[PDB]
Amino acid sequence: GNGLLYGKRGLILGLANNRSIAWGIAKTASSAGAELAFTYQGEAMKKRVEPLAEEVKGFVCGHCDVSDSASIDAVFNTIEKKWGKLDFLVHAIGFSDKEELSGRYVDISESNFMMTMNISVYSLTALTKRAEKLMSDGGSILTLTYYGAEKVVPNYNVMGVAKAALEASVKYLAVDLGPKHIRVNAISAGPIKTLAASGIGDFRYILKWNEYNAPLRRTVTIEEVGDSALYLLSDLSRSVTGEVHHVDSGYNIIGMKAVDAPDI
Amino acid sequence: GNGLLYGKRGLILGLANNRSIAWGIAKTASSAGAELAFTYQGEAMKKRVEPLAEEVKGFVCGHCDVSDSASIDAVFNTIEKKWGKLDFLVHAIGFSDKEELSGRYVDISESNFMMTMNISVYSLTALTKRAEKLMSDGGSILTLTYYGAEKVVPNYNVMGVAKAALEASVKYLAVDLGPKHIRVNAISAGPIKTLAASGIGDFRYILKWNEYNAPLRRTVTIEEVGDSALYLLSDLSRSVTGEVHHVDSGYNIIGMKAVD
Amino acid sequence: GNGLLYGKRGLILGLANNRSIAWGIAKTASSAGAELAFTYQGEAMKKRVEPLAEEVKGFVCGHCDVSDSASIDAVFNTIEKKWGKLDFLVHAIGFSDKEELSGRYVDISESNFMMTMNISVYSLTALTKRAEKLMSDGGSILTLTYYGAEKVVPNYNVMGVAKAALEASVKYLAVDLGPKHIRVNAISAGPIKTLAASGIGDFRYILKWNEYNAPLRRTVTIEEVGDSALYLLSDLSRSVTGEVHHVDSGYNIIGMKAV
Amino acid sequence: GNGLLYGKRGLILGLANNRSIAWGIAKTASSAGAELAFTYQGEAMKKRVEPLAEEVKGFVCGHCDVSDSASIDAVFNTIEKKWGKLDFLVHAIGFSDKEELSGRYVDISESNFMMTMNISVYSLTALTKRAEKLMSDGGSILTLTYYGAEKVVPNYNVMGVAKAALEASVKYLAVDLGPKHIRVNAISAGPIKTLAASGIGDFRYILKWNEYNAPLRRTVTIEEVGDSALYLLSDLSRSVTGEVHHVDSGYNIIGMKAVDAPDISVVK
Ligand SMILES: NC(=O)c1ccc[n+]([C@@H]2O[C@H](COP(=O)([O-])OP(=O)(O)OC[C@H]3O[C@@H](n4cnc5c(N)ncnc54)[C@H](O)[C@@H]3O)[C@@H](O)[C@H]2O)c1
Ligand SMILES: NC(=O)c1ccc[n+]([C@@H]2O[C@H](COP(=O)([O-])OP(=O)(O)OC[C@H]3O[C@@H](n4cnc5c(N)ncnc54)[C@H](O)[C@@H]3O)[C@@H](O)[C@H]2O)c1
Ligand SMILES: NC(=O)c1ccc[n+]([C@@H]2O[C@H](COP(=O)([O-])OP(=O)(O)OC[C@H]3O[C@@H](n4cnc5c(N)ncnc54)[C@H](O)[C@@H]3O)[C@@H](O)[C@H]2O)c1
Ligand SMILES: NC(=O)c1ccc[n+]([C@@H]2O[C@H](COP(=O)([O-])OP(=O)(O)OC[C@H]3O[C@@H](n4cnc5c(N)ncnc54)[C@H](O)[C@@H]3O)[C@@H](O)[C@H]2O)c1
């Protein structure tokens, strides 16, 4: 191991299965030395999270639905009693109504708008606020975003609006926690075939488009994103805060399909 | 007049008093020949909107609170019956808790976050759903935003997060409706002394900082924002959509305190 | 007309023929009341600029090649003698080796890099140096840029690097001259079939890609860019400076193929 | 050792002294296992580079002035004979007339504009041209930029125009070389007291301003930039290209001084 998180203790929310971006981050951080606490969303997720948590010599700290303030408080109560401190926090939580991830953005329902904003955006602020006084000087908070916050990606619709709000909240949070040297950053990941991302209409097309048009000519993996997360969670990135870090084979820099790019 | 909106018909939501940005927009648009309709938020706002509408020979189409879906349906039904089609729409509505626009972003309540996102962001999508039906022949939709959507500005907090979502929704809406040639744009205005803008704490300092450090060495007025709105509402800008247009004396371009 | 430039006088550099973006700017500005002066780049351009200037009752103030500082001085002397003051200036000048607007950016030549940077970027600062003396009462300076400054557009290559420097210089000039109320802005135009743009490798493809995928589902014209330029040159935009303004049917906002 | 650059060979251009950003990058890359080669710009620089190179078990591969294309090809000939392949390249080179890093950008001279663009921008493209054949199995190319490319920083002037071109060239190069898995990125560094940066007018004001107004309430060090560079030069960042990575204590995210942040008074 590289020892980059030796003796560090961190909390990961959003582990769903062994395809989760959160699982890539967990494997990498654990190999780097971190002891990891995991939450789970509802009893079903629990049976899948438990053997994964055992595999990284971490542990399951409890149920957390981020719309449930009491479940947030309980999780951080557990951490406080068990560790008395928290070195880093990974926010890998996102939700939007899969039915409305298609057609036109203008046709979304209000309930989908409110639910998407609350689960995908406010939850990072709620978690950071509850975590602030537990967090060590020099700590690191990490969330995940997508290029659809910057440019219009079809079928991503209200989630793009939500991710633009998430990236802005990262900057405001970074200013709030900066004097405590707690950094707040986001990885803008390229598309990866996960449970939640499968709900996007025509996701197969989006993957191939990235494979054909991204500079590196391939899509990224949870292990690659995990290594980039390790950098932002470790002291290697101690002067980096408020940053949207693209881990996407360079896709975000292209302004047009290559004329000789193959047709999908 | 310059005739840039001659014969055009537009709906303005968000006129509150004679210092509103919406009032600068209304005055310029009327002088350019537009027929204007106005909503009002509640009975106390109605008392101020009626004489201002009279001054520009516009008309008041009724009460609209954007948290009340039925009232949105009602004012758009009124406009549809009177005019049939709409040429432009101005969305000058924003709201956030005044007491939390001071102190730390991280300290905001969930209720304030959700209310701000709904009134300041969702409302544009809610209104555009209805307006699209009246703009089959094309049109222009305009909202208002602020540099705190791009960079951290003191005391703007959750409104900065909300305006970042608003600017993104402008681009998603512009993609939705572009094939119908309905354009959707935003003006990123500099700070101006209005009623809503007075709630932001330390506002006097924000104004002076812009006055002393913006390239043009002065803050902007509702009449200047009105003239930029006129461009975006008129056919002059017929190839512009999804744009966030800074009308801020250039403040958004500086990276540090000006030299003098 | 709309009168937006009534009583105003401006200088336009970069008119090549009746397809130039500068020609759309000229026609619109003339219809809005502006008195216009034009330069030309050499004898071949002169044969078209002179009668075109006549069609908008404009003034031909002479030859200007922005690589030739003496010729810049002479046109501004000519302007100063005739007018005294200048209300606005249009910089519609760009150049690169068309043979290298293809293949890989990394294969460009050093001489092409330097020539492109000089003609396409430094020229705006050089022209602004002289316009400043004539713009004591304020004014508006406009240049033209392209989305290839922000994101990679294939075959645009060193012109993309150049336009990124241009957009930055617009902002630094805006800080310099803003206290004198001289505004400096750029229009980021969508692709248009002009003499200069036609040398871009696979330019037809870039046009069609924009036609099929821009929000408005069409490319833009010199008359549409001219109307946006009118706004930025007129007092309607008197609180706008340092701005990069997209006139491109919304193309710059998309992140993937349209559906 | 963390071993993140175990067995890797890299070339570093731009080491001037023990305060250079390139020195921080070199110390970190060497600690992580890298075998390093250094150029020097002239004889006065050579006197400082040779002992610094020895300190990191590095090796000096000769004189390079990027306005002299013969010297570029010479050092890449030396590298190709000693090593054959190259894993990473560090471009820590910038220049502009320090007498004009003050007053108004509109008053710059044409020769200063052209010389700044050539040394500070085209040099990255020229170096990458040669490095391409030595990086046939992939690699990582890193340059340094500054937030004055994005927003106006007074007295940075033509250097900000140049850094905007440099950042664009990073993206175009990343597209060119991506298919060969050669990544091209930039670190946007916050201000650091170095030889070159000291030429900026009132650079101490820019430093104090960053200390009070950056989110982390401090300016950055060459060791911190070195650690961020380690990430971009190593396989940990193998899916990252075309990136402008801010290592600036977060300064770039600020849109206005806080109301209660200090108003700096100055004395002569
Ligand atoms: N997969 C991609 O292509 C991609 C690309 C860019 C960004 N991202 C982001 O990565 C993050 C992780 O998603 P993923 O792709 O790994 O998918 P995933 O399905 O593995 O993870 C999403 C997680 O969100 C959790 N979640 C949803 N609503 C919740 C709630 N109310 N309370 C608590 N937890 C809740 C789920 O339990 C799940 O663990 C998301 O923020 C997503 O937007 C993903
Ligand atoms: N004033 C500035 O300095 C400034 C700067 C940048 C952007 N803006 C934006 O300009 C817009 C107009 O603000 P202003 O400065 O003219 O202030 P204002 O006080 O004159 O107008 C705000 C309007 O919002 C309306 N509104 C609020 N909640 C509503 C609801 N639930 N339903 C219906 N209407 C509702 C009010 O009725 C009022 O007319 C806002 O979106 C604001 O964010 C203002
Ligand atoms: N046409 C497009 O698609 C497009 C898109 C974005 C931006 N632009 C920009 O618009 C501007 C005008 O170009 P256009 O498309 O109208 O083409 P054009 O061929 O009509 O005009 C280009 C002009 O540049 C002039 N020029 C070149 N080198 C010169 C020199 N050394 N000295 C003086 N003048 C010189 C030519 O004489 C000509 O008048 C350029 O800056 C171009 O990059 C064009
Ligand atoms: N120091 C800062 O505050 C700061 C901030 C942001 C970015 N940067 C960038 O970091 C890089 C390194 O600068 P530094 O601060 O370490 O300063 P430095 O003085 O330590 O290094 C600058 C180097 O550029 C080299 N150089 C200049 N002209 C050259 C030429 N013609 N040929 C070859 N080499 C040449 C010098 O020999 C020197 O080694 C530069 O690109 C600079 O713009 C510095």
Side-chain angles (χ1 to χ4, degrees), chain C residues 52-84 86-132 134-151:
Chain C
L52 289 175
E54 292 174 13
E55 299 302 302
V56 297
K57 305 203 194 203
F59 170 71
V60 175
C61 57
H63 163 81
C64 177
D65 191 301
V66 295
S67 72
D68 172 17
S69 173
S71 73
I72 296 182
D73 195 64
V75 303
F76 276 97
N77 284 333
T78 296
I79 283 294
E80 185 177 357
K81 177 171 187 199
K82 183 181 187 66
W83 282 348
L86 188 60
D87 294 302
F88 65 90
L89 185 140
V90 178
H91 171 262
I93 288 168
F95 187 78
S96 197
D97 190 333
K98 54 165 174 176
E99 306 310 322
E100 296 184 10
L101 294 168
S102 68
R104 312 186 304 171
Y105 164 76
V106 68
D107 293 328
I108 55 157
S109 68
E110 184 173 1
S111 57
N112 182 36
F113 176 94
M114 298 297 278
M115 182 189 312
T116 302
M117 291 300 315
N118 196 94
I119 306 306
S120 301
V121 188
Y122 178 73
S123 59
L124 172 66
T125 297
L127 296 163
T128 295
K129 235 311 179 80
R130 281 75 155 179
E132 183 188 6
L134 304 190
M135 290 187 194
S136 292
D137 291 6
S140 176
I141 301 181
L142 179 68
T143 190
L144 293 160
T145 187
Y146 178 58
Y147 184 52
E150 312 176 26
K151 303 289 189 179

Side-chain angles (χ1 to χ4, degrees), chain C residues 16-22 190-192 194-200 203 207 222:
Chain C
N17 68 3
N18 80 328
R19 307 297 190 85
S20 293
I21 292 176
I192 306 177
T194 64
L195 286 175
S198 295
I200 297 165
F203 190 66
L207 284 166
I222 63 175

Side-chain angles (χ1 to χ4, degrees), chain A residues 14-17 19-22 41 45 64-67 91-95 119 144-146 156 159 163 189-192 194-197 203:
Chain A
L15 180 57
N17 53 42
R19 306 297 178 90
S20 291
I21 292 175
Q41 186 202 2
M45 299 261 167
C64 184
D65 194 307
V66 293
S67 66
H91 174 258
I93 288 170
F95 172 85
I119 305 311
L144 296 157
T145 188
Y146 180 61
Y156 202 64
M159 192 63 159
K163 291 300 188 178
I192 306 166
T194 63
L195 171 53
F203 184 71

Side-chain angles (χ1 to χ4, degrees), chain D residues 68-80 83-84 86-98 100-132 134-138:
Chain D
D68 176 8
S69 62
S71 76
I72 292 177
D73 218 72
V75 298
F76 275 100
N77 279 329
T78 303
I79 297 304
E80 184 172 350
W83 287 345
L86 190 71
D87 295 296
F88 60 92
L89 188 145
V90 176
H91 173 254
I93 284 175
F95 179 82
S96 188
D97 184 290
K98 65 170 158 169
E100 290 183 23
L101 293 180
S102 57
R104 315 194 296 166
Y105 166 80
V106 67
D107 297 331
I108 60 164
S109 62
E110 176 178 359
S111 52
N112 182 32
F113 181 100
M114 300 304 303
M115 185 182 308
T116 300
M117 296 300 316
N118 186 273
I119 308 288
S120 304
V121 181
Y122 175 75
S123 66
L124 176 62
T125 294
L127 291 172
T128 299
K129 288 176 175 292
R130 275 84 169 185
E132 187 194 359
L134 304 182
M135 295 182 154
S136 40
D137 302 340

Side-chain angles (χ1 to χ4, degrees), chain B residues 224 227-228 231 238-239 245, chain C residues 224 227-228 231 238-239 245:
Chain B
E224 297 157 4
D227 276 351
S228 292
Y231 163 66
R238 60 198 177 280
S239 298
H245 179 45
Chain C
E224 293 155 6
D227 278 349
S228 295
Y231 160 67
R238 64 197 173 277
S239 288
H245 179 52

Side-chain angles (χ1 to χ4, degrees), chain A residues 55-56 58-80 82-84 86-97 100-154:
Chain A
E55 181 173 319
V56 292
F59 77 102
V60 169
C61 62
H63 164 89
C64 184
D65 194 307
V66 293
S67 66
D68 182 357
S69 184
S71 72
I72 296 181
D73 191 23
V75 159
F76 282 95
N77 285 342
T78 290
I79 299 297
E80 189 183 345
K82 186 168 168 77
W83 291 348
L86 188 63
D87 298 308
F88 60 90
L89 190 156
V90 180
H91 174 258
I93 288 170
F95 172 85
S96 201
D97 183 352
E100 293 181 25
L101 292 168
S102 65
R104 314 185 305 162
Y105 166 77
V106 66
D107 293 326
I108 61 157
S109 68
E110 181 176 353
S111 181
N112 181 30
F113 178 95
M114 297 309 276
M115 176 71 62
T116 303
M117 291 302 313
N118 188 284
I119 305 311
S120 307
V121 182
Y122 171 75
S123 61
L124 169 62
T125 296
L127 291 169
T128 302
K129 168 67 179 169
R130 185 62 181 81
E132 180 185 14
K133 297 184 179 192
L134 268 199
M135 294 257 328
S136 58
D137 208 281
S140 184
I141 298 168
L142 176 67
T143 189
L144 296 157
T145 188
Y146 180 61
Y147 186 55
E150 312 173 17
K151 303 294 183 178
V152 173
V153 170

Side-chain angles (χ1 to χ4, degrees), chain A residues 66-67 69 103-111 113-115 117-118 121-122 125 128-129 132 147-154 156-162 164-166 168-169 171-173 175-177 180, chain B residues 66-67 69 103-111 113-115 117-118 121-122 125 128-129 132 147-154 156-162 164-166 168-169 171-173 175-177 180:
Chain A
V66 293
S67 66
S69 184
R104 314 185 305 162
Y105 166 77
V106 66
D107 293 326
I108 61 157
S109 68
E110 181 176 353
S111 181
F113 178 95
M114 297 309 276
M115 176 71 62
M117 291 302 313
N118 188 284
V121 182
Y122 171 75
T125 296
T128 302
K129 168 67 179 169
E132 180 185 14
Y147 186 55
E150 312 173 17
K151 303 294 183 178
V152 173
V153 170
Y156 202 64
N157 301 1
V158 73
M159 192 63 159
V161 174
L166 178 69
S169 79
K171 299 173 196 173
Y172 278 84
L173 289 168
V175 168
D176 283 336
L177 303 192
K180 292 169 195 205
Chain B
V66 295
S67 59
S69 189
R104 304 190 308 162
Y105 170 72
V106 72
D107 288 332
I108 61 162
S109 66
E110 183 182 10
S111 54
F113 178 100
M114 300 304 289
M115 187 64 55
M117 294 299 319
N118 189 277
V121 185
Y122 182 66
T125 296
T128 295
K129 298 171 169 287
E132 168 191 21
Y147 185 52
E150 308 174 27
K151 301 294 181 176
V152 176
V153 164
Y156 206 57
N157 298 348
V158 71
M159 263 303 249
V161 170
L166 180 68
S169 74
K171 307 179 185 306
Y172 276 88
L173 290 165
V175 161
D176 286 334
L177 304 175
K180 286 177 178 197

Side-chain angles (χ1 to χ4, degrees), chain B residues 2 4-5 12 19-32 88 90 142 144 187 189 192 220-234 245 247, chain C residues 231 235-240:
Chain B
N2 58 45
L4 289 174
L5 286 172
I12 294 179
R19 310 311 194 203
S20 300
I21 294 180
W23 179 234
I25 297 176
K27 282 195 297 178
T28 298
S30 184
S31 170
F88 59 96
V90 179
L142 182 65
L144 293 159
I187 282 172
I192 307 167
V220 308
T221 63
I222 63 176
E223 286 83 16
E224 297 157 4
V225 171
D227 276 351
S228 292
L230 174 61
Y231 163 66
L232 286 176
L233 295 168
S234 76
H245 179 45
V247 185
Chain C
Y231 160 67
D235 290 332
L236 289 180
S237 61
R238 64 197 173 277
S239 288
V240 179

